[PDB]
Amino acid sequence: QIYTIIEELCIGCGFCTDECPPKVNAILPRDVEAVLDGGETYWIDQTRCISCSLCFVAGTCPTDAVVFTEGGVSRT
C-alpha cells in the first residue's frame, strides 16, 4: 500500500506529520516560498515511509489530503 498527500488541498498544519513515528520521519515540510496561506506543505517521502497508515486513519486533516491507496484511492 501507499499513502500520498494531495499538495493542492493540504495546508501545512501538522496534524499528519504528527502521527509519523519520529524515528522514521516520513512526512515532511517544504517551507517558505512566499506563503501566508497554508504556510507549508507536507508530502510523504516514499524513499522512507514504513506505511503504518497512521496518518490516514487518524482522521484529523481538515482539508482531507491523506490519500491511502494500494489498488484504488479513497480518502473521505
Partner: protein
C-alpha cells in the same frame, strides 16, 4: 457572554468561514490548524467554551 455558546451550538463542525474554504472541524478540542489564512487559533468547541 453568550454569543460563543451559539457558536458552539451551530458551528461545531462548520462555520461559514470554514465552509468557504471546505474545512470541517475534526474534533471538539483541537487548538488550531494555522498559520494558514492569517491564522486560525480558537475555532474549536472547547475554545468557544473558554
Amino acid at each position: 457572554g453568550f454569543i460563543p455558546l451559539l457558536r458552539i451550538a451551530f458551528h461545531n463542525y462548520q462555520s461559514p468561514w470554514y465552509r468557504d474554504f471546505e474545512w470541517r472541524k475534526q474534533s471538539p478540542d483541537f487548538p488550531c490548524i494555522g498559520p494558514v489564512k492569517g491564522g486560525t487559533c480558537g475555532v474549536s468547541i472547547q475554545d468557544q467554551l473558554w
